[PDB]
Amino acid sequence: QPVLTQPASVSGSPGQSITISCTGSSSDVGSYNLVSWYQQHPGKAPKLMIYEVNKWASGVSDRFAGSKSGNTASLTISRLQAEDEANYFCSSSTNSATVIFGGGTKLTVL
Amino acid sequence: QVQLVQSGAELKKPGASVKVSCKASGYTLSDYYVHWLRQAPGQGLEWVAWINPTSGRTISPRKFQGRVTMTTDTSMNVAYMELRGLRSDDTAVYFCARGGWISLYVDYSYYPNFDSWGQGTLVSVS
Amino acid sequence: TRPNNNTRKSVRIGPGQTFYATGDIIGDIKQAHCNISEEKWNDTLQKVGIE
Ligand SMILES: *[C@@H]1O[C@H](CO)[C@@H](O[C@@H]2O[C@H](CO)[C@@H](O[C@@H]3O[C@H](CO[C@H]4O[C@H](CO[C@H]5O[C@H](CO)[C@@H](O)[C@H](O)[C@@H]5O[C@H]5O[C@H](CO)[C@@H](O)[C@H](O)[C@@H]5O)[C@@H](O)[C@H](O[C@H]5O[C@H](CO)[C@@H](O)[C@H](O)[C@@H]5O[C@H]5O[C@H](CO)[C@@H](O)[C@H](O)[C@@H]5O)[C@@H]4O)[C@@H](O)[C@H](O[C@H]4O[C@H](CO)[C@@H](O)[C@H](O)[C@@H]4O[C@H]4O[C@H](CO)[C@@H](O)[C@H](O)[C@@H]4O[C@H]4O[C@H](CO)[C@@H](O)[C@H](O)[C@@H]4O)[C@@H]3O)[C@H](O)[C@H]2NC(C)=O)[C@H](O)[C@H]1NC(C)=O
Ligand SMILES: *[C@@H]1O[C@H](CO)[C@@H](O[C@@H]2O[C@H](CO)[C@@H](O[C@@H]3O[C@H](CO)[C@@H](O)[C@H](O[C@H]4O[C@H](CO)[C@@H](O)[C@H](O)[C@@H]4O)[C@@H]3O)[C@H](O)[C@H]2NC(C)=O)[C@H](O)[C@H]1NC(C)=O
Ligand SMILES: *[C@@H]1O[C@H](CO)[C@@H](O[C@@H]2O[C@H](CO)[C@@H](O[C@@H]3O[C@H](CO)[C@@H](O)[C@H](O)[C@@H]3O)[C@H](O)[C@H]2NC(C)=O)[C@H](O)[C@H]1NC(C)=O
Prior knowledge:
This is part of a larger assembly, with chains A, B and C. Chain B is mainly β. Chain B contains no helices and 10 strands. The relative contact order of chain B is 0.32. Chain C is an alpha+beta fold. In chain C, about 25% of the residues lie in helices and about 20% in strands. Chain C has one helix at about 40-50; strands at about 10, 20. The structure holds a molecule of 11 linked components (NAG-NAG-BMA-MAN-MAN-MAN-MAN-MAN-...), a molecule of 4 linked components (NAG-NAG-BMA-MAN) and a molecule of 3 linked components (NAG-NAG-BMA). A molecule of 3 linked components (NAG-NAG-BMA) sits at the interface of chains A and C. A molecule of 11 linked components (NAG-NAG-BMA-MAN-MAN-MAN-MAN-MAN-...) sits at the interface of chains B and A.
């Protein structure tokens, strides 16, 4: 049943902007706008950084965009700094009443 | 202040069973749904189930239907998740997490809004 | 509002005719309710009271 997808690894550039996106089906992404984005460092627990696309999570700088469009959504990071060296998972909920995670993608150095 | 202290790690024979407990701290477990999550070494985050701790009502996606059985003891303020029929995949870091506030008039059980997380406990397999 | 997400289950009851029941409920179980704004209800009820 888990189906959600995103590019498995990408790289950024300091001071520039990068797009980190995820895609799904109309059953889970376009059916409802319930989406969130998570940061986890190895050896530590995750940390919610977006919820409901653009409700504002705690401790999140204005670099971290949150947008949705149809079957897709993305953190369009702007000003793209280096102190976020671990992954950025996507996640949304299915119309079957379940939560889904993506495959994770690494905001690599940068 | 919030903590979701989990029980320790324990390796099991494949096909065995294990009980994993998640402790509440700073809040009463009856407020929020408890979501159960996992992370295998080198893999992403895998969603396992939720429990409405009051009624004990649960949903798990398909892969864990029958694998996972659920209980709570809100007098002790602890949440449990029992696995049976293990496999090599179950070498993974289970996390317990509290999700949405329980409101009698709106269903927040099913959407990815995890506030705080367990530290991580490792069901393992040789 | 009826917050439960009921699903209709089709059953065939006799020759060439169906009965529709309720199947499994998707999601969590919740209570049906109706809401009214209470300051406006109070003003309305006092306005009845003066008549
Ligand atoms: C009809 O009618 C009916 C009736 O009304 C209805 O129903 C309704 O509906 C609605 C809508 O739907 C809903 O809403 C919901 O609600 C919920 C609840 O609320 C409540 O509660 C809470 C909690 O409480 C607790 O805590 C506190 C602190 O905080 C305290 O104080 C208390 O006391 C409690 O405590 C506990 O614990 C303790 C310990 O010691 C003990 O002692 C005790 O006993 C207990 O146990 C609270 O909080 C709230 O408040 C809030 O809000 C308000 C508004 O409402 C405001 O005003 C305030 O100020 C506050 O604020 C704060 O907080 C918040 C949270 O909430 C945040 O956000 C802000 O910022 C501030 O800070 C009350 O009181 C709630 O919760 C919810 O919310 C959620 O969801 C939403 C959706 O919309 C969203 O938007 C939001 O955002 C949220 O989310 C958030 O939160 C959550 C929680 O958990 C989470 O999960 C998430 O994630 C987020 O988070 C946050 O935080 C974090 C930290 O932690 C961070 O990091 C992040 O970033 C963020 O920030 C909602 O709102 C309701 O409920 C209902 N009702 C009933 C009764 O149920 C219906 O609907 C009608 N109908 C129709 C058809 O409609
Ligand atoms: C209302 O009550 C009815 C029962 O009166 C209930 O319907 C039952 O649902 C269960 C769960 O879906 C059905 O059992 C399954 O049927 C499938 C058919 O493909 C089997 O493959 C399943 O077998 C696996 O799971 C078993 C454990 O449940 C294992 O022991 C087994 O080895 C397999 O791994 C499973 O048996 C059951 O057939 C129906 N019953 C009827 C009469 O249709 C319904 O769900 C209840 N309503 C609600 C909302 O819960
Ligand atoms: C509550 O449950 C229902 C069903 O599980 C969810 O909504 C419904 O989901 C079905 C299946 O995806 C949708 O079916 C589609 O209907 C259109 C009608 O034009 C049809 O063209 C398609 O071929 C398909 O059959 C249905 O539209 C959809 N209904 C709504 C109102 O979204 C719903 O997501 C669940 N809600 C919650 C909160 O869990």
